[PDB]
């Protein structure tokens, strides 16, 4: 069959011969970032990062090659009722308006797993590390945190909540009025969640070894990245409730509204064919076939099938304004499309600094958001601030806000 | 896990859909990415450009 020329990640694209080829490349890149159930024994694994979707659905429009990728068994995405409309301006320039009521009902909700590990490694007869709950009167250098979440073994228990300045593993190293130093493990800053599983074992070296899995539920929000299977990625721009969403005559509000302007320059016509075929599939009860090179499926046959179900044959519907109730003058293309929630969330990316840690050598702010570092005001930014003539802003960026010294 | 049924894999807290093909090295699952190279023992004749050699047949 000629559709065996595609690999694993391009075999999930419905109608890839109707797409411009860079968009197939982008979906092959972004199907690997899609959130689903990555493996069925995810409750046993202490992976450092894990992303499990609450309600993965298999696609309504499928290729025949996804029976062998096991995508029907471990799917990564949800069939979303997707209107292609300009609504209130919040889906412009590759954005998505989402239904807040759908998101409240579990639409694209997911759980994030972070795993932390510590070895209770004795290094000689001088420096001994112990899993124990530190106390102020005994341990030096405790980080002014909440230390009573820990149990008697120095390890936190499943079910406890933790914020970014909480300790989960209490580790003290004996010090050669303070017998030992605190070398405990805290969560990542600006993180939160429930302790999900604490596993205690011993490694090859025979030392006590813990892995603690912390779970946090990530509800979709503004700035979370969603993509279809046609390279049509975009952050959530706003979330409207069901009574603000546009609706059909039978009360169907779209889960997602994407911009019309995402289509013409990209020519993802397979996206529109997948919406049409998904409308036909959801009304018929079939799962549509979107195997690439098929003469049994063209747009006219899908249209005739759709018009057999009391719909417009081209998949448009008369939507009503959610705010005013008035009919929208244009008829809106709306139908079920498989969206993926990508691992690029905004709460994993938001970072600000005011003043904090500085590098030991050059006394400039640290590197990266994981250590409360600053952003590099680089050479091109310096060049642009030169072109502005803003000499004092350039001076405070490159002298006062990084490393003032005398 | 070779030749085990789905029930035996689920008894070992393994996923029956897991394909394998990787190594567990210090608890990290490590996959060997296939590396391409020129085929050996085959005579290839190229034109080295802007060089003292007009043609070059390597093996």
């Amino acid at each position: 069959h000629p559709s065996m020329i595609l690999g694993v990640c391009a075999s999930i694209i419905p109608f890839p011969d109707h797409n411009q080829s860079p968009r197939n490349t982008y979906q092959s890149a972004m199907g690997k970032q899609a959130m689903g159930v990555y493996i069925t024994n995810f409750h046993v694994r202490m992976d450092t990062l894990a992303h499990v979707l609450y309600y993965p659905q298999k696609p309504l429009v499928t290729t025949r090659s996804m029976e062998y990728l096991r995508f029907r068994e471990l799917p990564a995405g949800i069939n979303s009722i997707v209107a292609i409309a300009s609504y209130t301006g919040y889906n412009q320039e590759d954005s998505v308006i989402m239904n807040r009521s759908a998101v409240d009902r579990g639409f694209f909700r997911s759980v994030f797993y972070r795993s932390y590990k510590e070895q209770e490694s004795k290094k000689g007869f001088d420096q001994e590390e112990v899993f124990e709950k530190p106390t102020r009167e005994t341990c030096q250098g405790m980080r002014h945190a909440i230390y009573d979440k820990l149990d008697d073994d120095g390890l936190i228990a499943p079910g406890v909540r933790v914020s970014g300045d909480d300790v989960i593993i209490g580790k003290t190293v004996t010090l050669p009025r303070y017998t030992k130093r605190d070398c405990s493990t805290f969560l990542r800053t600006s993180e939160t969640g429930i302790v999900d599983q604490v596993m205690v074992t011993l490694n090859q070296e025979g030392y006590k070894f813990c892995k603690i899995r912390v779970r946090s539920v990530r509800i979709p929000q503004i700035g979370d990245k969603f993509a279809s299977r046609h390279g049509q990625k975009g952050t959530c721009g706003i979330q409207y409730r069901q009574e603000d969403m546009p609706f059909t005559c039978e009360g169907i509000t779209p889960d997602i509204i994407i911009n019309p302007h995402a289509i013409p320059s990209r020519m993802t016509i397979g996206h529109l064919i997948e919406c049409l075929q998904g409308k036909v599939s959801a009304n018929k009860g079939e799962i549509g076939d979107a195997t690439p090179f098929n003469d049994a499926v063209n747009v006219q046959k899908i249209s005739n099938l759709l018009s057999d179900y009391g719909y417009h044959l081209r998949g448009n519907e008369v939507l009503y304004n959610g705010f005013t109730g008035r009919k929208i003058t244009s008829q809106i293309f709306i139908g079920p499309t498989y969206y993926q929630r990508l691992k690029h969330m905004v709460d994993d990316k938001i970072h600000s600094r005011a003043r904090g840690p500085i590098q030991i050598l050059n006394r400039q702010p640290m590197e990266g958001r994981s250590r409360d570092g600053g952003l590099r005001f680089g050479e091109m930014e310096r060049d642009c601030q030169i072109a502005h003539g803003a000499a004092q802003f350039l001076r405070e960026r490159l002298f006062e806000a990084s490393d003032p010294y005398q | 896990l070779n030749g085990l049924t789905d029930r035996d894999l689920c008894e070992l807290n393994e996923c029956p859909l897991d394909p394998g093909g990787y190594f567990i090295i210090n608890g990290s699952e490590k996959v060997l990415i296939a590396q391409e190279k020129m085929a050996t023992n085959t005579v290839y004749v190229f034109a080295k450009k802007d060089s003292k050699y007009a043609y070059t047949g390597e093996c």
């Binding site: 065996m4 029976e67 062998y68 | 394909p19």
Partner: peptide, 29 residues
């Protein structure tokens, strides 16, 4: 006798199903 053009689209996916039934997807590794 032979596979007619109407049975071909199911014959080819039967043989692809048999291929992936033995070989799987990580057979090279």
């Amino acid at each position: 006798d032979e596979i007619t053009p109407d049975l071909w689209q199911e014959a080819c996916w039967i043989v692809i199903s048999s291929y992936f039934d033995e070989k799987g997807l990580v057979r090279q590794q």
